[PDB]
């Protein structure tokens, strides 16, 4: 499609809307020009969703509890409020960890205060204090507690900070109040920011006066990898083969102590910019720790990233970097040789959260595929700045896409594959379009690193080329 065809598609689709919605949505849809650096000239983002249009977005509680805090494995995270949020978000996100669940690790459990009417009418702070005592009795090996506020908490005027302070002092325990109520912000995004500030204020400074950690010149932290299907492990292995020491993973497979040790590292390696740039900036301001963005999706990006990271250290690390690259060369070359001829030229549309809609493009290109449309639920303009140069000219960009728009765009563009989430999957399969989940990895993965690229390629091929897709039309029709 031509720029003009894409522009006319946008206008065609927007004809369905009442005027207020039409005027708004027009600002959130754009035809890419890789020649632009300032995305605020071409697309609006990080605004409220229009009522009634079937946004795909979640809320701040999802961004805080579901995304940032929930993966921390040796803490207990309380979903504080009525029973739904914590139940719908129980073990939905594949933030993998090693532990003994119910004993020293708690990730896939749902701890809740299960608010009833009396809690709304009279407040939940007394219940929260009692709940904390019950947690301590029944889960003695927990290493800290977080309180993940659901919608009612701030609305009714509860004081979870006071409870957290008083109980934390009483019990000599880290108890973290998080004001991530879903009424705040417009999406998951503000939950990331709230969550980062809670780490800053209640956890990160604990060891500021402690000099006992045995630091080395090669200490790093992986910032913003939630270990989906083991993604952070398949990243860590490479960094340590290169001679680095990964002191912390924020927050996939993460422990409270590794978070507390992070201010001792030499370099913060930021994968998910959107969710963790806030704490990365804090750590540079307060501790002098530099940070850098990287990308472990596919061999081209992984090799570039390894080299850029190694360049921050000495010649010994740069030599090990080239050794790692040489080791894995035949492995990813074999993956390309098998799968690229099966995928070459195929066209993909993506719709994901805050990072992957741009970050996975290189991996598709390593298999000869073209990303012809992409967009984000909750990205900001700094994300779109990073996207426009990654996407081809005249491709389609969509911010906070509506269900209607996404379906209509797909009907016109006719991609060979769509990569999006669970609320999208079953729609597009019925349309006969191969679909891969690009949040959960469709219960596969890892996709990060060299080992992840093999799985990624296998998965894109198994689905795009599956025999089922030739069977949707009955032969009598």
């Amino acid at each position: 499609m031509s720029r003009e065809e894409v522009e006319s598609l946008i206008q065609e689709v927007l004809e369905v809307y009442p005027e207020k919605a039409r005027k708004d949505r027009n600002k959130h849809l754009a035809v890419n020009d890789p020649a632009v650096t300032q995305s605020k000239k071409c697309i609006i983002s990080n605004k409220k969703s229009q009522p009634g249009l079937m946004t795909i977005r979640g809320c701040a509680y999802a961004g805080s509890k579901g995304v940032v805090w929930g993966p921390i494995k040796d803490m207990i995270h309380i979903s504080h409020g009525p029973v739904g949020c914590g139940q719908y978000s129980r073990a939905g996100r594949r933030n993998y960890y090693i532990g003994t669940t119910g004993v020293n690790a708690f990730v896939t459990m749902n701890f809740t205060s299960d608010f009833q009417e009396k809690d709304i009418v009279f407040g939940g702070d007394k219940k929260l204090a009692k709940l904390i005592d019950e947690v301590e009795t029944l889960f003695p090996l927990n290493k800290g507690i977080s309180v993940q506020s659901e919608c009612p908490i701030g609305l009714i005027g509860d004081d979870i900070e006071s409870v957290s302070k008083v109980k934390g002092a009483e019990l000599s325990k880290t108890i973290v109040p998080v004001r991530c109520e879903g009424f705040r912000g417009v999406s998951q995004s503000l939950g990331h920011h709230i969550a980062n500030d809670a780490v800053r204020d209640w956890v990160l400074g604990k060891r500021d006066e402690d000099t006992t950690f045995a630091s080395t010149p090669y200490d790093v932290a992986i910032i913003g990898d939630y270990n989906i299907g083991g993604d952070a492990w398949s990243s860590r292995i490479l960094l340590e083969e290169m001679g680095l020491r990964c002191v912390a993973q924020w927050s996939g497979d993460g422990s409270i102590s590794e978070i507390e040790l992070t201010p001792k590292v030499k370099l913060n390696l930021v994968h998910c910019y959107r969710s963790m740039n806030y704490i990365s900036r804090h750590m540079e301001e307060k501790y002098g720790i530099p940070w850098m963005e990287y990308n472990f999706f596919g061999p081209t990006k992984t090799i570039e990233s390894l080299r850029a990271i190694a360049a921050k250290f000495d010649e010994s690390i740069q030599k090990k970097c080239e050794e790692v690259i040489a080791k894995y060369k035949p492995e990813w070359e074999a993956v390309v040789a098998k799968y690229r001829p099966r995928l070459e030229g195929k066209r993909v549309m993506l719709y994901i959260g805050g990072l992957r809609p741009r970050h996975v493009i290189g991996a598709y290109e390593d298999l000869g595929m073209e990303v012809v449309g992409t967009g984000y639920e909750f990205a900001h303009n700094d994300d779109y700045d990073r996207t426009m140069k990654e996407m081809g000219d005249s491709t389609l960009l969509y911010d906070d896409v509506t269900g209607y728009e996404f379906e209509e765009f797909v009907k016109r563009i006719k991609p060979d594959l769509i990569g999006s989430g669970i609320k999208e999957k079953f729609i597009f399969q019925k349309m006969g379009i191969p679909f891969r989940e690009m949040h959960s990895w469709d219960y596969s993965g890892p996709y990060h690193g060299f080992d992840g690229f093999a799985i990624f390629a296998r998965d894109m091929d198994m689905t795009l080329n599956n025999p089922c897709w030739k069977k949707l039309q009955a032969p009598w029709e």
Binding site: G84, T112, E117, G229, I237, K423, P446, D451, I455
Partner: protein, 522 residues
């Protein structure tokens, strides 16, 4: 590393030695992990009676609930009406979760909108969100009805749904005649089943309260059927099939079976099937109304009795042999239709299966959970099978319901070692299956973590899960099954006996150890 011709996903990739070594180094270097002896000690303690007693003393903490929140049920109810868009007034995060939750159970699209209230709406409310939301939803998704429920933010701020909808029509955002039934569905009251009841009663009121003067009970010669919160496609289907076989005129009020099972033929169908507006408008003219899941249809019952003047029969859920018999006999009485030969034969085929399988079922002990009607029907059928339902858990049950189940247990010798628990969660149930170990659990996918815990104590302590209930996320297509009627009883019986026989085969598979009992014929 990977070998290209046999690529490993996370399992078993991370069992490779290099990954194992890396993970050990992570642990030792940076996790400050409790020693394994201490982890083992605490695990063992969590399996004890002493721990169970502390666990059952909880007042404030809930762990691993076996319920969800009201608007989930309102959405499912709404999905059962023709060309109807579920609409939840309040916070959009809730709708992402409701959709995802049902997506994962049905493996189908689930359409639902929010009106995206934000913090600003705390100053004077969500009225503008309602106006633009209704207009936008109608224009974009072209429903013939929008069924409105609420999230907890909207309830706490106190938004008056009725007033807001009325003002939306007054000010021209949607046509005056466009149907916008509503219900308040606070998540801090009851559970998902309560939301279903509230939504249904709201829809029933919308179509009938103001038009009662021309209604005559029995004049349409049909029976209304209200299914309640129901997540097995086969359950909608079996009720319709039985009534059709009997020649009984009926109206199934809330029927999502089509929209939860559209074909993959090249097009997405946002809406399919469903109860029509004409069916709801005409419902007071029925002979009577039968509630399939009465323990969560109490508000609906008061409306149907008080306003439609239907003498709703006292029937249990039609699960198992006796209660399916009672359902059919009552439907025969109301409709005047005889029970047909086909259903008599089907009944006798279930009884034959019971005779065939009774020796392996006899005395088998079960822990089980779910919603109140489902649980009581499962208990009843287990007693009919000569099984012992020893731990009966209903997190969202009430005292009156528990009394009723205790009376069912009293009517059978197979109930002697059973206890009913209300308000208790799956962390409570975990203790019970350690301290008073049953043979199996019957429950939803959250039970898998209990089975995992039991196996960790040892193979001899493992309690296998049999997946019946909601949600089931870790197996495919079980939502197509049936639990109601003779058909559902046959399905449940088959599942139970073959779970018993699969486990016995596992236990007898050891060559020259236990395989003396690895019989070809069972």
């Amino acid at each position: 590393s990977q070998q290209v011709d046999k690529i490993k996903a996370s399992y078993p990739l991370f069992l490779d030695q290099d990954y194992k070594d890396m993970l050990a180094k992570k642990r030792d270097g940076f996790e400050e992990k409790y020693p394994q002896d201490k982890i083992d000690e605490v695990f063992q303690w969590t399996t004890t009676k002493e721990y169970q007693e502390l666990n059952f003393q909880r007042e404030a903490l809930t762990v691993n609930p076996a319920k969800a929140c009201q608007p989930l049920g309102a959405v499912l109810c709404a999905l059962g009406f023709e060309k109807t868009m579920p609409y939840v007034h309040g916070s959009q995060g809730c709708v992402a979760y409701f959709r995802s939750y049902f997506n994962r159970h049905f493996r189908e699209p689930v359409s639902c909108v929010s009106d995206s209230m934000t913090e600003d709406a705390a100053v004077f409310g969500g009225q503008q969100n309602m106006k633009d939301g209704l207009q936008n939803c109608k224009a974009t998704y072209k429903p013939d009805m929008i069924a409105v429920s609420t999230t907890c933010m909207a309830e706490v701020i106190g938004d008056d749904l009725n007033a807001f909808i009325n003002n939306s029509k007054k000010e021209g955002f949607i046509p005056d005649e466009f149907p916008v039934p509503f219900a308040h569905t606070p998540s801090f009251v009851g559970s998902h089943v309560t939301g279903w009841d509230n939504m249904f009663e709201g829809i029933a009121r919308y179509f009938t309260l103001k038009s009662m003067d021309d209604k005559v009970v029995g004049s349409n010669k049909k029976i209304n059927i209200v299914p309640g919160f129901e997540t097995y496609l086969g359950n909608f289907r079996v009720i319709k099939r039985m009534l059709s076989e009997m020649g009984v005129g009926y109206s199934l009020l809330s029927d999502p079976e089509e929209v939860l099972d559209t074909p993959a033929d090249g097009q997405f169908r946002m809406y399919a099937g469903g109860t029509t507006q004409e069916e709801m408008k005409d419902a007071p003219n029925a002979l009577n109304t039968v509630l399939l899941q009465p323990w969560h249809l109490e508000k609906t019952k008061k409306f149907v009795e008080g306003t439609w003047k239907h003498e709703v029969p006292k029937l249990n859920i039609p699960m198992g042999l006796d209660w399916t018999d009672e359902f059919l006999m009552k439907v025969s009485e109301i409709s005047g239709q005889p029970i047909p030969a086909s259903l008599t034969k089907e009944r006798g085929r279930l009884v034959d299966m019971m005779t065939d399988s009774h020796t392996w079922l006899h005395g088998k002990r079960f822990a089980l959970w779910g919603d109140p009607d489902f649980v009581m029907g499962l208990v009843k059928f287990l007693l009919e099978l000569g099984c012992e339902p020893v731990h009966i858990l209903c997190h969202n049950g009430n005292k009156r319901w528990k009394k009723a189940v205790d009376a069912i247990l009293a009517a059978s010798p197979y109930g002697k070692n059973a206890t009913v628990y209300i308000g208790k969660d799956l962390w409570h149930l975990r203790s019970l299956v350690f301290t008073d170990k049953p043979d199996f659990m019957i429950g939803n996918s959250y039970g898998k973590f209990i089975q995992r815990d039991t196996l960790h104590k040892g193979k001899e302590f493992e309690v296998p899960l049999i997946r019946i209930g909601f949600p089931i996320f870790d197996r495919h297509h079980l939502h197509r099954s049936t639990t109601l009627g003779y058909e559902g009883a046959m399905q449940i019986l088959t599942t139970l006996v073959n779970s018993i026989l699969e486990r016995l085969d596992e236990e007898t598979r050891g060559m020259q150890a236990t395989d003396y009992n690895h019989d070809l014929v069972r």
